[PDB]
Amino acid sequence: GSPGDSSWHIYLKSGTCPFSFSKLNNFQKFKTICFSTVEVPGSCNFPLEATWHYTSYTIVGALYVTWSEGNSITGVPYPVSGIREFSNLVLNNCTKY
Amino acid sequence: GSPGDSSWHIYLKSGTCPFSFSKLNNFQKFKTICFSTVEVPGSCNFPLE
Numbered sequence: 001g002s003p004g005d006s007s008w009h010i011y012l013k014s015g016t017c018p019f020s021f022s023k024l025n026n027f028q029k030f031k032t033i034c035f036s037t038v039e040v041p042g043s044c045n046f047p048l049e050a051t052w053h054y055t056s057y058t059i060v061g062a063l064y065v066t067w068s069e070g071n072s073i074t075g076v077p078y079p080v081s082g083i084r085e086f087s088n089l090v091l092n093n094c095t096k097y
Numbered sequence: 098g099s100p101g102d103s104s105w106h107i108y109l110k111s112g113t114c115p116f117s118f119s120k121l122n123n124f125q126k127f128k129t130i131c132f133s134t135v136e137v138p139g140s141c142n143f144p145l146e
């Protein structure tokens with residue numbers, strides 16, 4: 001209720017996967033992913049960290065992710081609703097196509 | 098008491114860390130290390146033989 005969590009900072013680290021958690025929403029393409037929160041064979045992971053005012057670090061948990069190369073499943077920045085074919089185009093000055 | 102360990106040889110191997118256990122005493126620089134003898138996520142290891 002009262003936000004006593006102001007002192008503790010908890011965030012994700014960088015694991016061994018060949019991508020990043022914050023850049024999965026970009027237009028990245030895969031075949032299957034199947035995230036999980038328990039250990040399974042053949043799967044990279046992102047550790048979790050907890051700290052008090054950036055003095056002493058400790059590891060708390062992890063997130064386990066699998067994947068397989070493909071061209072079927074694509075991430076999206078945010079869920080646009082009400083359309084039938086996701087596309088966008090901005091003209092006449094610099095963009096990132 | 099009597100050194101019966103004369104036959105058995107036990108030593109460390111080379112793991113997956115990008116350094117060595119016998120050369121950690123040299124002038125090597127880090128930020129934190131925090132050795133442990135139990136499994137924790139995101140950590141290399143030295144086997145025993």
Ligand SMILES: *[C@@H]1O[C@H](CO)[C@@H](O[C@@H]2O[C@H](CO)[C@@H](O[C@@H]3O[C@H](CO[C@H]4O[C@H](CO)[C@@H](O)[C@H](O)[C@@H]4O)[C@@H](O)[C@H](O[C@H]4O[C@H](CO[C@H]5O[C@H](CO)[C@@H](O)[C@H](O)[C@@H]5O)[C@@H](O)[C@H](O[C@H]5O[C@H](CO)[C@@H](O)[C@H](O)[C@@H]5O)[C@@H]4O)[C@@H]3O)[C@H](O)[C@H]2NC(C)=O)[C@H](O)[C@H]1NC(C)=O
Pocket residue numbers: 082083087089
């Ligand atoms: C390659 O070329 C093709 C050429 O066909 C491109 O496809 C066309 O792309 C156009 C541009 O998007 C489509 O036109 C409209 O796009 C609008 C996008 O919104 C932005 O732009 C408008 C422009 O005024 C702006 O106001 C708005 O704020 C946004 O900035 C859409 O909103 C719009 O949808 C509306 O119109 C359609 C069509 O209805 C029209 O025609 C009817 C007759 O068939 C007529 O009775 C209507 O009065 C109207 O004149 C309509 O279906 C939509 O309905 C919405 O609401 C209902 C609920 O009532 C909902 O159920 C439904 O799902 C909709 O949400 C809405 O009123 C236009 O789509 C154009 O439609 C595209 N044509 C085709 C065939 O796809 C293509 O993009 C190009 N590709 C590339 C890569 O460039």
Ligand SMILES: *[C@@H]1O[C@H](CO)[C@@H](O[C@@H]2O[C@H](CO)[C@@H](O[C@@H]3O[C@H](CO[C@H]4O[C@H](CO[C@H]5O[C@H](CO)[C@@H](O)[C@H](O)[C@@H]5O)[C@@H](O)[C@H](O[C@H]5O[C@H](CO)[C@@H](O)[C@H](O)[C@@H]5O)[C@@H]4O)[C@@H](O)[C@H](O[C@H]4O[C@H](CO)[C@@H](O)[C@H](O)[C@@H]4O)[C@@H]3O)[C@H](O)[C@H]2NC(C)=O)[C@H](O)[C@H]1NC(C)=O
Pocket residue numbers: 092093094
């Ligand atoms: C380089 O690229 C950039 C891309 O970022 C581009 O920037 C665009 O610039 C154009 C103009 O040059 C901008 O278009 C303007 O849009 C104005 C309207 O925006 C207001 O109104 C929105 C809703 O309109 C209501 O009312 C109308 C009727 O008036 C109605 O039809 C609508 O349905 C609706 O009910 C409103 O949503 C919007 O707020 C958005 O943004 C805020 C943040 O600011 C956000 O918090 C909101 O949630 C929301 O997303 C805003 O309040 C419009 O008034 C304006 O018109 C003037 O210019 C035209 C010429 O263009 C004149 O003819 C006219 O007389 C006015 O003087 C103009 O059309 C556009 O928004 C910019 N951004 C994008 C992404 O396109 C640059 O132009 C490019 N070029 C250069 C050189 O930089």
